[PDB]
Ligand binder design. Structure first.
Ligand SMILES: Nc1ncnc2c1ncn2[C@@H]1O[C@H](COP(=O)(O)OP(=O)(O)O)[C@@H](O)[C@H]1O
Ligand SMILES: Nc1ncnc2c1ncn2[C@@H]1O[C@H](COP(=O)(O)OP(=O)(O)O)[C@@H](O)[C@H]1O
Length: 203
């Protein structure tokens, strides 16, 4: 089974993907996590990607397409989490999968309003060593766990990221709808309820 998780930043895509991957044995491919590792390592990809990420812009498509070609799991279940982010990326994914006799089985759209997104992102904190994600209100880290706020989770960058999502990423809703594989999630609900909805789709 191949899944794509699609929706605004802060919808809870990563949170749900990590849980589904561990509980059911999917390989979790998060372009954001992979990009952050590249930036930390100072690879050619990381060095180039860094300034786009800092500004809240998308990293250029060709970089992302190459990355996915490089890390694509050839067998087994996969969750693409925050990829594709543009129509060109989605077209490239379809072509990759078709060469392998595969297809995207379900695209889960995590629907959530802007006000909720902004609260989710503003309160997001991460363990920079493990990538584990917390929220100051809805899931605070326990004692002993050092967290930071992502620089792109500051107010002005959130604003930019939501604009970018609406312009470049939201068209994927229609792209996948017209393949007949889109499934809608209410990602504004609490974390357990969102997970129930995810399970309902894949079952
Ligand atoms: N259903 C939810 N209700 C409240 N907070 C949530 C929910 N899902 C995730 N969170 C929190 O909201 C923020 C965004 O979640 P995250 O999984 O990073 O989203 P995405 O991967 O879609 O950007 C994090 O701070 C996370 O702890
Ligand atoms: N598929 C992608 N295409 C282009 N840029 C990406 C992609 N995935 C992640 N990024 C870059 O990484 C940044 C953070 O993305 P991500 O880690 O998915 O965080 P969030 O869950 O808050 O959207 C994006 O704003 C963009 O700069």
């Amino acid at each position: 089974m191949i899944l794509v998780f699609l929706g605004p930043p802060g919808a809870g895509k990563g949170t749900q993907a990590k849980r589904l991957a561990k509980e059911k044995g999917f390989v979790h491919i998060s372009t954001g996590d992979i990009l952050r590792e590249a930036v930390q390592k100072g690879t050619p990809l990381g060095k180039k990607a860094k300034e786009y990420m800092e500004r809240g812009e998308l990293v250029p498509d060709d970089l992302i397409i190459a990355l996915i070609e490089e890390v694509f799991p050839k067998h087994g279940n996969v969750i693409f989490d925050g990829f594709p982010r543009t129509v060109k990326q989605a077209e490239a994914l379809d072509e990759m999968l078709e060469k392998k006799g595969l297809k995207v089985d379900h695209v889960l759209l995590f629907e959530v309003p802007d006000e909720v997104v902004i609260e989710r992102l503003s309160g997001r904190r991460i363990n920079p060593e493990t990538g584990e994600v917390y929220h100051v209100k809805y899931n605070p880290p326990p004692p002993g766990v050092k967290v930071i706020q992502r620089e792109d989770d500051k107010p002005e960058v959130i604003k930019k990221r939501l604009e970018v999502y609406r312009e470049q990423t939201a068209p994927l809703i229609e792209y996948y709808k017209k393949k007949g594989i889109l499934r809608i999630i209410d990602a504004s609900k609490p974390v357990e309820e969102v997970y129930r909805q995810v399970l309902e789709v894949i079952g």
